[PDB]
């Protein structure tokens, strides 16, 4: 039974050779969207896929069959929304003809893209018994919107699912769904934003208009963030969804090392390129239970890895001006020392 080991290298090649024949279809299921705190639907590094080695010139009906089987669903009670990267640095689900663009080879539906990520829409697992089917979708008068709730109090995003809705329907007819899915009372006054892309978070002003108008460049996969219109958002440092998405686009992790501690491993803080000295000192101060006026920061020599000039506590710049001398790996870093009393 060692000759069963003439076949480990007979596929360590037979597969290395045929590899050009196959593509990697990376399925994502909607659950992987919960918790995600950034833009778009997930995070390619923290996302987890169900991977499919599928024949480049395979068929799509063949995939749905293989798919339905492997994951355990009815080849007719599910939907494939191929993930699609856009010119604005955003990857969102896009339509697919599950019957017309189904005469084609799998590789070309991918647009010669491998790997090929595809959002897998499944009927809810509860609604299953109910005789629930996955509702019909008119690829011309309906749209699929994804819903995120923003909580200023935690400054976190709570996924709220998706919805088939006709375009003609008006934003006002969507707010009840939002209150509901967010665990909110009905008629709770809400504020709404389309997440267009990083740093762009347009606020949706006129509710009583149809989506087709209410959303600039409406498309399947657009994203509406909503939040309570409550006065206690104003005690939050990022009171609106927009302010969160800004501070997140501007967000940057920085290492801090005590100059006096030799080979100080130091620690990481997450800061914002448009913070100023007070904001940085106040932050890093909290992270060590000591007064900010007790921290002496040093600029960056940018060449030697040792602290540069002492940073006067009246520094008129921003955190960015201090960090512009860094590159990739060079793990953006400054030096401090604790002061007496």
């Amino acid at each position: 039974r060692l000759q069963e080991e003439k076949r480990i290298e007979a596929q360590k090649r037979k597969e290395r050779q045929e590899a050009h024949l196959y593509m990697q279809v990376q399925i994502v299921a909607e659950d992987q969207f919960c918790g995600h705190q950034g833009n778009d639907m997930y995070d390619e590094e923290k996302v987890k896929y169900t991977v499919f080695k599928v024949l480049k010139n395979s068929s799509l009906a063949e995939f749905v069959q293989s798919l339905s089987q492997t994951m355990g669903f009815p080849q007719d009670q599910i939907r494939l929304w191929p993930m699609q990267a856009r010119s604005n640095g955003t990857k969102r689900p896009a339509m697919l003809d599950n019957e017309a663009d189904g005469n084609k080879t799998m590789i070309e539906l991918s647009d010669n893209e491998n790997p090929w990520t595809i959002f897998l829409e499944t009927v809810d697992p509860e609604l299953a018994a109910s005789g629930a089917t996955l509702p019909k979708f008119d690829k011309d008068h309906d749209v699929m919107l994804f819903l995120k709730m923003y909580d200023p109090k935690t400054r976190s995003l709570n996924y709220c699912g998706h919805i088939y809705t006709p375009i003609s329907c008006k934003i006002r007819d969507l707010l009840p769904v939002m209150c509901d899915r967010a665990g909110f009372i009905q008629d709770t006054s809400l504020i709404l934003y389309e997440e267009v892309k990083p740093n762009l978070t347009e606020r949706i002003q006129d509710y009583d208009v149809s989506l087709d108008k209410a959303l600039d460049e409406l498309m399947d996969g657009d994203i509406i963030v909503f939040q309570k219109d409550d006065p206690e958002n104003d005690n939050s440092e990022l009171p609106t969804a927009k302010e969160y998405f800004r501070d997140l686009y501007h967000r940057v992790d920085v290492i801090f090392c005590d100059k006096t501690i030799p080979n100080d491993p130091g620690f990481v803080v997450t800061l914002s390129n448009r913070m100023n000295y007070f904001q940085v000192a106040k932050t890093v101060a909290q992270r060590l239970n000591t007064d900010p006026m007790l921290l002496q920061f040093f600029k960056s020599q940018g060449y030697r890895d040792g602290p540069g000039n002492p940073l006067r506590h009246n520094y008129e710049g921003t955190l960015r001006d201090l960090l512009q001398f860094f590159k990739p790996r060079q793990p953006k870093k400054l030096y401090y020392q604790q002061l007496k009393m």
Binding site: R86, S87, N88, T90, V143, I167, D212, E217, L218, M219, D220
Partner: peptide
């Protein structure tokens, strides 16, 4: 009129 590109 829902679009096709961005």
């Amino acid at each position: 009129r829902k679009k096709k590109r961005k």
